[PDB]
Amino acid sequence: AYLEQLQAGLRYLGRAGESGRKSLDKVVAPVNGAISEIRGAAAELENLPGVSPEMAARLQRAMRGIGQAQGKVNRVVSTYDRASRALLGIDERLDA
Amino acid sequence: AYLEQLQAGLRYLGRAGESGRKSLDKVVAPVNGAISEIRGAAAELENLPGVSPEMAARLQRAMRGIGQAQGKVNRVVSTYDRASRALLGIDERLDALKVQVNSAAQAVGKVAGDISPTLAGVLPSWLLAPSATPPSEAAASLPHLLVLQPLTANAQPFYFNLNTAAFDALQRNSAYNWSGQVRLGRRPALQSVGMGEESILLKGAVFPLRRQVGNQEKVVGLEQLEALRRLAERREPLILSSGYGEVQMGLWCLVRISENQSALLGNGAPRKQTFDLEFKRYGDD
Amino acid sequence: TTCRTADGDMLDSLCYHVYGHLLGCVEATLDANPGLADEQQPFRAGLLISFPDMP
Amino acid sequence: SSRLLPPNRSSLERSLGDVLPAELPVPLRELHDPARCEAALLPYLAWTRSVDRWDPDWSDEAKRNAVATSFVLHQRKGTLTALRQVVEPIGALSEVTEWWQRSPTGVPGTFEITVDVSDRGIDEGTVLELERLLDDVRPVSRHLTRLDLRI
Amino acid sequence: MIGMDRRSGLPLSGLAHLKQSVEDILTTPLGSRRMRPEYGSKLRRMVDMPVSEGWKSAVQAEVARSLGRWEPRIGLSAVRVVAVVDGRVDLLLSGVFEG
Amino acid sequence: MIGMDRRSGLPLSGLAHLKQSVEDILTTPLGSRRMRPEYGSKLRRMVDMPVSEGWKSAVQAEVARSLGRWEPRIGLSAVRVVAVVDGRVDLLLSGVFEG
Amino acid sequence: IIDLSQLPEPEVIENLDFETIYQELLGDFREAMAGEWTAEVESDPVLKLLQLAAYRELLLRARINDAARAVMLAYASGADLDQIGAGFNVQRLLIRPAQPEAVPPVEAQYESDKSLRNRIQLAFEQLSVAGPRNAYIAHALGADGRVADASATSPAPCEVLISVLGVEGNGQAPEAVLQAVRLALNAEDVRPVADRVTVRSAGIVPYQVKAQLYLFPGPEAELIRAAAEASLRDYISAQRRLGRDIRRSALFATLHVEGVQRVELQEPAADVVLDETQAAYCTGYAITLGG
Amino acid sequence: MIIDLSQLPEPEVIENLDFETIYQELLGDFREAMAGEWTAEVESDPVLKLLQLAAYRELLLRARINDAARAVMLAYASGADLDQIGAGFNVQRLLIRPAQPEAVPPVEAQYESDKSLRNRIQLAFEQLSVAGPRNAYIAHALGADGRV
Amino acid sequence: APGHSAQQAVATAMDGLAEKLRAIAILDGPNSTDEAAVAYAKNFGSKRLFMVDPGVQVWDSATNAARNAPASAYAAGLFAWTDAEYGFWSSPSNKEIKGVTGTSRPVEFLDGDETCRANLLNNANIATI
């Protein structure tokens, strides 16, 4: 179900790294909505025989985009104080 | 009863901000005589349907004046000590003028709104826009000797030819920074510690009565060395563009202009202007 | 400092002609202008921009 | 766009100039105009306008005027002049009672109102709503629950 | 440096990218780029001016400015009129390679 | 800058205010203003003097002083006698615009 | 007074995923290259531009949605209801603000969200001064040591029965706090109407709950058992906030957290009723596990 | 008793923009996406024609959202955007001088400025609505004139 | 003849008067589309005619809107600005027009011999803003 999973997975991180401009609490729910939801494809893609010459360039189109989504979150988060980030507790969450 | 109220209300504040020059106690009684008395119009003007095109410009004539009355009181009061003002206790009283008069100004603005801030200084998109067409110097029938051109890239360049300046000398000093360190028993060691100042010095003469080439009904001007001055007060480097060896010379800031204008006319106009420009190479990356 | 366009005048060109640079000079123009960015960027001939000071 | 490009451009740049911006509508000013809200998010605006009673059976012309005139209704709750307009989708403005039409100094109960409602669109049902649709306009103790009707 | 071609989208790197780097300088007018107003050449202002011997030295002095800004890997040598047909002048843009 | 007209009270801003700004300089004598003694021109002292070629250069040198004080947005170019009728000389006050 | 800001999110613009945005851009790219498109044109530096563009309006459809959240009172966050409450005459007040008794320990505090949002929701119910059913409520929320009000009338007209309930501890509100509503209702009521102020207009019966929950064989039973009261101890404080009923299912559904497979209830035989007049109080709870 | 709009805190959705912090992201999203196959960051490369469109047209769409977010807030809307706030609260913009001229130059229909709508939209609450209490029977009894 | 040169009878009158006068006649096409002005230029070929078809519009103080000027007199003021400041031998095309706003037709232009509305008019011996 990776055709449904990762493309929806990048949609959460589009809300994560952008609804965090001048606030903290709106970051945690799409990040929780991604880590337990990108796992739904990291466990799904454990066993595939290389299904198509297509259908996996789509995975390369997605994982480049999710690779851009880490850079947007981890730079918007890094603009904050550490003490305001420690009370929220997403230092031990963005590593997931 | 606002026709009786606000016009009498400004009369108290005329006593407030003026009978307070070298004293404090004469301020409090007209200020108390205004705050509980401008309220008599701020509660009166709560319900008016916009009664007249007149009768509320009078309110605008009054509330501009009461707006001037806050500025007179709050500056005369501010000349005093805070401790002499705290013993009187009108720090917690002049703020009620910021409550009642603002409630009165909001009441006037509901009945009669303000005029729109009309616009008369609306210009087209030209008066701050450079004429990007090249001048008549660049289209002349003379090959350009040297070209000054700045970093803004839209400003008008200066063209050296027989119509404008036409130097005939070109000093080009170029040092190289080798620093000597004296050793005791031997020759002093030399180290390359940089590049040093490279300079270009342009001599020459402008004769501002010789007519332009081909008799174009136009002479070499008196303006035509002051254009070198205007192009030099830009605090800006210049690209030199010759036409013989390398064409892309570097960034060269202009440092010195010194003309010797003599053989004068009646109104001070010279007919020779022997100048010497002097550049230094701006060290860009 | 209100200016009026032509049918081909453009925003980053205009506030470069007014200010002299474009670092922090376009979005400050778009800030103090209601409905300017909603209009198409090749401008029409009769829209007014009030260029603010200190971009 | 393709117009923002310089005059020298390939057909590739002119094509990528028409795709890479990828303009979008901004439906943000439409959230507070009840006549321009979408029908799927209209009761979000009915919440912030504090529309007390709502029916998922009305036409949108009867749903949007309850939000647009939610100010004028909630400004004057004790009046009759918004009791006339609170019954808007049930089209009815016929008759209302007052003190001096009854000669013996009012009813025992100091004149609770028995208003007249005249509906013609819906005949089946349409009674059980009007004793509670008119409850917010009615004060808590200025009236009693006595009511009059007409079909 | 490896860039892509303007037409056909193909990534070409060595010296075909060098030639299209120059022709993006020469044919863009000033201020046509977005947020880069000091980019391009005044050669469009030199379009449809009479070919005098001062027009030649004003093109050499303006190609050298515009390539001196945004093309540091090219040392300009000379610009020469080599033919004239009706309107169509043609210029041998010769320059050594640096960088 | 937006000012009002001298006659008729109308607020005129762009360049009609520029011309009446100059004619408040040229026609006020020095010391006629209140608490501003170094305002105005010595042109009233030049009234009813013979029009020589040194009178012309003394008017150019005095308009340039008086406009240099209280009119910085005007760069003076020249002052020229263009006609002479009985007593009435008339001067083409030409100057470029700055500011 | 029910919070709308805890529902699933409304999308004013649709929020498509990354793939159908990308294929929509290629359909725009084939039509723009019409007549001169070749398969060699869509090279590697060309396609990676289109993968950027499909990523940027994924961040613009997320920007329009996040802007449209913070405009509606449904899902509006802090320092932005002050822009909305200024349109509804709602300003946050000071609950012991930054008075420096000692200068480095600054103690600044404002009104929080989700009750300021209620005061914006109660804005239009404060315009009518002729006293509808909510203006007696919304003007009685001016005090601090109470909770919200319910209005009713059984007797003869112009006799208002309002039930002033209060959340400060064990049940009964003080009578000195009860006198503040008549100081809060002087120029807000109607002048002929006359209210009686009853604090407990029906009576208080003591309630408890005793639940023998089961948790999964798995994570620790210390923070998950205590997380059941995180949705319960704020639920009991919200019952007399509306003055409305508790159910048997209120004692079930407020104990389901992440990691629950079955629950159990003994304290009611059947559910109790709490009308607009009737209210109650819960004394002390004991929720353990059966395993 | 209304609060001034000049003491409100700044909201969440309004953002200062930068062309560089959009364009340096588009460099920092495309350079890693090429994996070293594209390395000509000279401006003459025709991707930097287009990344200066995707950072310029995005900055216009980032500004339209800031333009629309000000248009739905009372402390920032102006023009015909306070008309939509005014139409919801039954407040219309005034007419100081009337619309129709009798002469050949057309007299402009003089409306009040938008700085006075913010006076009138905010005073649309503390307003005579209904004569409930003792302070409202008398203020609704100001229909006559010869009276104290 | 500003406005009175879309008619052929006056454009032929300005034609035959030009070689008597040793001048050039700056006529203008109609303000319709491009092929209405390309086919209007095919009635001539008489060495003395310089046609500028987009009637450019100018801002007005009284109207407070966009006017409609025939744009044949603007090319005459540009030729008088050219031959006195740049010389008559200089080509009076690439120079600035003052007193101007947008044109009555948006006329696109590129580089590289496209299907542009600039190269279409110029190859039909028609000048254009």
mmCIF file of C-alpha atoms in Angstrom, chain G residues 32 41 101 109 145 190 242:
data_model
loop_
_atom_site.group_PDB
_atom_site.id
_atom_site.type_symbol
_atom_site.label_atom_id
_atom_site.label_comp_id
_atom_site.label_asym_id
_atom_site.label_seq_id
_atom_site.Cartn_x
_atom_site.Cartn_y
_atom_site.Cartn_z
ATOM 1 C CA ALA G 32 2.779 24.271 -23.500
ATOM 2 C CA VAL G 41 13.197 17.342 -23.988
ATOM 3 C CA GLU G 101 7.765 41.665 43.752
ATOM 4 C CA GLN G 109 0.097 35.650 32.723
ATOM 5 C CA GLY G 145 -14.483 32.022 41.118
ATOM 6 C CA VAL G 190 -34.677 44.468 31.863
ATOM 7 C CA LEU G 242 -22.875 23.576 30.475
#
